[PDB]
Design a protein around this ligand. Structure first.
Ligand code: A1EN3
Ligand code: GNP
Length: 168
């Protein structure tokens, strides 16, 4: 079994908890306390490899310290999540990427950009806009629905594929 330390980052309300809880418990949670940050572990097979996924679902206040720095740099891959009906969450992605790059002290950090809530009609962030920022950073882009589970497995597996590429 290969262990893979994944961190899900992004604004409040984008569905970081819904996405984690779908992969790991296979149900959609309408309300999950927005304050609650936790690690979830799941044994899964990805491309024939048995993996233990250790997923930090981030929450809480914007609050930089040496110990939050340490905690974040143990992530091997980051799922940078925005909601397709939340322009501000999309504009925040650069920030999250910059904090990842800083605590990793590196410009090549395994990462997937995730456009969540693709089930919703009110979309303010176009696929094309997201695709453009992805190709810019050199990372995969995937649209997801924690609600229907569209793209959820693919999102997390794609990240794992990214971690493999990075360590050949
Ligand atoms: C997230 C994150 C994070 C990493 F991804 C990597 C390394 C980090 C090292 C740290 O010491 C701290 C964090 C970290 N933790 C929380 C963080 C946090 N909160 C408030 C909203 C929800 C939450 C789950 O993101 C927790 N929020 C932000 O950015 C929020 C914005 C919006 C308000 C003003 N902020 C700066 C910004 C832009 F766009 F320039 C977005 N960063 C966090 C951060 F870097 C790191
Ligand atoms: N329609 C729809 N609703 C979603 C989807 N994912 C999450 N939601 C909803 O959007 C809200 C936020 O979800 P949640 O997972 O709590 O967001 P979060 O990023 O985890 N916030 P936090 O930082 O507190 O953990 C909830 O009402 C949840 O039901 C999705 O793909 N589609």
């Amino acid at each position: 079994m290969t262990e893979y330390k994944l961190v899900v980052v992004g604004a409040d309300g984008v569905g970081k908890s819904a996405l984690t809880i779908q992969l790991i418990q296979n149900h959609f949670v309408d309300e999950y306390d927005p304050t609650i940050e936790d690690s979830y572990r799941k044994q899964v097979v990805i491309d024939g490899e048995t993996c233990l996924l250790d997923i930090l679902d981030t929450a809480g206040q914007e609050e930089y310290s040496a110990m939050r720095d340490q905690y974040m740099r143990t992530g091997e891959g980051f799922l940078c999540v925005f909601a397709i009906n939340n322009t501000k969450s999309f504009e925040d992605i650069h920030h999250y990427r910059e904090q990842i790059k800083r605590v990793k002290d590196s410009e090549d950090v395994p990462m997937v950009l995730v456009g969540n809530k693709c089930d919703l009609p009110s979309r303010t962030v176009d696929t094309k806009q997201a695709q453009d920022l992805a190709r810019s950073y050199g990372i995969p882009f995937i649209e997801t629905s924690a609600k229907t589970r569209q793209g959820v497995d693919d999102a997390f597996y794609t990240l794992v594929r990214e971690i493999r590429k990075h360590k050949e």
